[PDB]
Amino acid sequence: EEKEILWNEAKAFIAACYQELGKAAEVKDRLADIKSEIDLTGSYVHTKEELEHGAKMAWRNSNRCIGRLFWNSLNVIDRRDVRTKEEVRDALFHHIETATNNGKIRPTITIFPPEEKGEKQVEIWNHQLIRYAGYESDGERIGDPASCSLTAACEELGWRGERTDFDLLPLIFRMKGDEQPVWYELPRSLVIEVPITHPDIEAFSDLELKWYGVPIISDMKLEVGGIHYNAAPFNGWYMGTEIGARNLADEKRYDKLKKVASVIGIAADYNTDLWKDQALVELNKAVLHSYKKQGVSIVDHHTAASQFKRFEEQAEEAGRKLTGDWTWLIPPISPAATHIFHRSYDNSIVKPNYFYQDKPYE
Amino acid sequence: EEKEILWNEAKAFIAACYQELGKAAEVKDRLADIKSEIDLTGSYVHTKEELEHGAKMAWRNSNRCIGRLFWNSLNVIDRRDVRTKEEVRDALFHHIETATNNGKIRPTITIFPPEEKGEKQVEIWNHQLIRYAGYESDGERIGDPASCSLTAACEELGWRGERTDFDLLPLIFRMKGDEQPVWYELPRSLVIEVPITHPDIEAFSDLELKWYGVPIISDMKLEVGGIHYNAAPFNGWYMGTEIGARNLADEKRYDKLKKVASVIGIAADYNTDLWKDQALVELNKAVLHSYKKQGVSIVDHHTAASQFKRFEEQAEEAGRKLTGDWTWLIPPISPAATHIFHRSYDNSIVKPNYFYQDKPYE
Ligand code: HEM
Ligand code: HEM
Ligand SMILES: Cc1cc(N)nc(CCc2ccc(CCCN)c(CCc3cc(C)cc(N)n3)c2)c1
Ligand SMILES: Cc1cc(N)nc(CCc2ccc(CCCN)c(CCc3cc(C)cc(N)n3)c2)c1
Ligand SMILES: [Cl-]
Numbered sequence: 025e026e027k028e029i030l031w032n033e034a035k036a037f038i039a040a041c042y043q044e045l046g047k048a049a050e051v052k053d054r055l056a057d058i059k060s061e062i063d064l065t066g067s068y069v070h071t072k073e074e075l076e077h078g079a080k081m082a083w084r085n086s087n088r089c090i091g092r093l094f095w096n097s098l099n100v101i102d103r104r105d106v107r108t109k110e111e112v113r114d115a116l117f118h119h120i121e122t123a124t125n126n127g128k129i130r131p132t133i134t135i136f137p138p139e140e141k142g143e144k145q146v147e148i149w150n151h152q153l154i155r156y157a158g159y160e161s162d163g164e165r166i167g168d169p170a171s172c173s174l175t176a177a178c179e180e181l182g183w184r185g186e187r188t189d190f191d192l193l194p195l196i197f198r199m200k201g202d203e204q205p206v207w208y209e210l211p212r213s214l215v216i217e218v219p220i221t222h223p224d225i226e227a228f229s230d231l232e233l234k235w236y237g238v239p240i241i242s243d244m245k246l247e248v249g250g251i252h253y254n255a256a257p258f259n260g261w262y263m264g265t266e267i268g269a270r271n272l273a274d275e276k277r278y279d280k281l282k283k284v285a286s287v288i289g290i291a292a293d294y295n296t297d298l299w300k301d302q303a304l305v306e307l308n309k310a311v312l313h314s315y316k317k318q319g320v321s322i323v324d325h326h327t328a329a330s331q332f333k334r335f336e337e338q339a340e341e342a343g344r345k346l347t348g349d350w351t352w353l354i355p356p357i358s359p360a361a362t363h364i365f366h367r368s369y370d371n372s373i374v375k376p377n378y379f380y381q382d383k384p385y386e
Numbered sequence: 387e388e389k390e391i392l393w394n395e396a397k398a399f400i401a402a403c404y405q406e407l408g409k410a411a412e413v414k415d416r417l418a419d420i421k422s423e424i425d426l427t428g429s430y431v432h433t434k435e436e437l438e439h440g441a442k443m444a445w446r447n448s449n450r451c452i453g454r455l456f457w458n459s460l461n462v463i464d465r466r467d468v469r470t471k472e473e474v475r476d477a478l479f480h481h482i483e484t485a486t487n488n489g490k491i492r493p494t495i496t497i498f499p500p501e502e503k504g505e506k507q508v509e510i511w512n513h514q515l516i517r518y519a520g521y522e523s524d525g526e527r528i529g530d531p532a533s534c535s536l537t538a539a540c541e542e543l544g545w546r547g548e549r550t551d552f553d554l555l556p557l558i559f560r561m562k563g564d565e566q567p568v569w570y571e572l573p574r575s576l577v578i579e580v581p582i583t584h585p586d587i588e589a590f591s592d593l594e595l596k597w598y599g600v601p602i603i604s605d606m607k608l609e610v611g612g613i614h615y616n617a618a619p620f621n622g623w624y625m626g627t628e629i630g631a632r633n634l635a636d637e638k639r640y641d642k643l644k645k646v647a648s649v650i651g652i653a654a655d656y657n658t659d660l661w662k663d664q665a666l667v668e669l670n671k672a673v674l675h676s677y678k679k680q681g682v683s684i685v686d687h688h689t690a691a692s693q694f695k696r697f698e699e700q701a702e703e704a705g706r707k708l709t710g711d712w713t714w715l716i717p718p719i720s721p722a723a724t725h726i727f728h729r730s731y732d733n734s735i736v737k738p739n740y741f742y743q744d745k746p747y748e
């Protein structure tokens with residue numbers, strides 16, 4: 025059963041991948057080889073060409089992603105050779121460095137050895153490789169509340185945060201055969217951060233807001249032809265709203281809208297003044313302005329939606345069905361100002377793809 | 387078959403309606419009466435109590451409506467006695483007057499005789515009782531593009547618009563047995579309109595925008611216990627975003643965002659300036675301000691979402707399942723600033739309800 029799942033998934037992937045690569049004639053022989061290998065070993069090993077194209081397909085099939093136009097230029101780093109925690113740490117440090125690329129962000133994925141018997145070889149605990157800690161001790165809230173449980177887990181293992189609102193969490197991952205994960209403090213030279221200022225309102229700097237340059241999702245599983253790559257961190261560049269309308273704005277995150285309203289000099293007293301809406305717009309302008317000013321890649325939601333329209337056209341033109349999650353594709357700011365809002369999307373799951381998996385803590 | 391549909395729907399409705407009315411014991415006798423009546427006549431007639439509560443239930447079950455907190459105070463006008471076009475016209479005029487209520491809008495529905503053999507007794511052509519005409523002659527666009535096809539149909543029947551951007555369409559409806567609908571110009575004394583000004587920006591009046599006070603949806607079918615009330619116009623008061631973020635903002639409607647940007651004194655050149663977002667916020671502030679200043683009921687999307695939260699709690703507290711369409715419930719401005727955005731809703735259809743029906747023109 026488990027291996028029939030593998031063979032069926034392998035069949036579909038190799039056929040599809042090789043068609044896209046103009047390698048359709050090699051499918052028959054390659055499947056024989058794969059079938060023998062599953063027979064003789066219980067699994068199979070992707071060629072580097074398969075691995076790279078599979079990761080790209082997986083991005084292409086990510087229903088919730090507005091940035092998919094650029095799927096085919098994903099920079100895929102093959103790290104299936106890794107066996108030690110030093111090698112993992114160094115691969116993660118390297119991913120941060122090459123993806124950041126001095127601000128000119130490169131969409132990158134580093135792929136670690138896949139699950140064996142559903143047994144992980146490398147288990148990453150971080151949600152993102154770069155993220156801020158969060159604390160909640162006796163009524164006082166510090167940092168990013170979304171990081172509270174991971175932060176508590178790190179502090180169990182002998183890490184201690186400075187309890188600033190922007191403590192960088194350490195890298196934390198466990199190796200197969202180890203009982204506890206290890207942690208490593210991020211070298212600050214690796215991590216670009218951007219201070220948030222506003223183009224016109226000088227007082228905006230009084231909020232002392234900042235955010236990190238590169239979102240590197242490190243807790244999803246990449247699945248390709250029945251192989252489960254549970255550890256495969258990937259990054260793009262930010263869409264501004266992710267920072268200005270969610271990370272810094274949500275009541276359950278940094279919750280900064282009342283403070284924004286005060287520095288931009290409007291009252292925060294009446295719903296009918298639309299002060300939250302006005303504060304959201306200004307904070308979002310500041311975020312775009314700040315990233316651009318520092319030379320760190322970022323895209324606004326209008327340009328993003330325009331790019332996504334092109335992805336849609338490209339898919340049609342290539343004869344591929346389009347899939348999407350409307351509820352995630354619409355930006356959280358002026359959604360009806362984008363074309364996305366005014367059409368519908370088929371939310372079917374197509375593989376290869378990226379999937380949620382259970383957290384190893386909490 | 388057709389009558390088995392009717393009896394099954396009647397069974398479910400009478401049971402449910404009478405439970406809610408504390409009249410559970412009368413269900414058995416009432417169903418016998420109904421069953422005989424379908425047997426003897428092919429249909430049945432609602433008591434006034436059933437009709438009123440059914441219309442209220444229908445509002446309660448409208449998945450796409452954020453305003454449902456107030457379902458139980460709907461003002462139901464029973465006009466099943468109507469037989470002539472003068473009576474229909476007068477009932478429609480009356481609905482406008484009593485719903486408008488000098489600006490203190492009353493959620494109201496007027497219910498006309500239901501379909502007989504799927505044969506309409508009264509067929510209303512208007513989408514809303516009050517709406518602006520739209521024209522598109524040889525490249526030049528005037529008025530509301532959404533009204534183009536109905537406007538063309540009216541002008542076929544000998545009506546002529548002044549071709550202002552805000553021509554009030556005439557009431558247009560057809561009677562059973564008539565080949566053509568009739569039309570009647572709206573008395574302007576009946577129709578409250580609001581000029582759009584901004585609380586701080588004096589130049590905003592230069593846009594000469596306005597909108598009508600009361601949205602009265604007149605093209606949906608109310609279904610109650612298997613009876614099809616195809617003509618049953620209903621109204622609430624506006625949520626500000628419907629006007630500021632859609633009617634006046636959409637590129638396929640009045641398309642005013644570039645003009646808004648100019649009068650509020652910002653450039654409309656770069657996506658990263660979020661000029662569309664900023665223009666949307668200011669236009670939406672102006673709309674709320676203008677309605678409030680004139681004494682015409684309106685609700686902002688924050689207050690609306692707060693009221694909807696109470697509807698949710700009320701439903702749970704009453705032991706009723708909640709249904710909703712997330713894609714319509716989220717406001718088109720700052721949706722993530724409402725609780726709606728952060729939860730999910732079951733989009734199942736529960737009856738009684740309001741349903742789309744085919745337009746009799748186009
Ligand atoms: C190149 C720049 C990119 C941009 C601007 C972008 C934009 C976004 C945005 C805005 C979201 C939505 C998050 C939310 O709604 O809060 C998202 C989700 C997602 N993106 Fe992208 N993205 C990019 C690159 C990538 C890459 C390189 C991958 C993987 C190879 C990827 C895969 C995904 C996935 C899987 C999700 C869903 C995450 C989840 O379900 O939690 N994206 N993207
Ligand atoms: C009391 C004030 C009311 C407010 C503020 C309100 C608010 C809204 C809003 C914002 C929409 C969405 C339109 C859109 O997304 O563009 C809507 C849709 C709807 N509302 Fe309400 N509403 C109210 C009263 C009513 C009443 C009295 C009824 C019927 C008895 C009703 C039934 C509906 C229905 C059926 C829709 C869906 C229309 C469609 O599918 O095209 N609402 N409402
Ligand atoms: C690779 C990449 C690039 C980029 N610009 N953005 C992303 C998405 C980042 C991200 C990270 C974390 C999260 C939190 C939940 C995921 N377990 C999210 C999604 C946030 C969200 C929350 C809600 C309530 C709705 C919604 N649509 N989206 C999105 C990935
Ligand atoms: C009774 C009532 C009160 C009130 N405040 N609002 C309404 C809804 C009015 C309305 C009128 C017309 C329409 C146009 C289509 C309906 N055939 C709409 C819905 C507009 C819309 C468009 C799009 C693209 C998405 C969306 N969610 N909603 C909404 C009814
Ligand atoms: Cl993020």
Ligand SMILES: [Cl-]
Nearest residue numbers: 601628629633
């Ligand atoms: Cl409307």
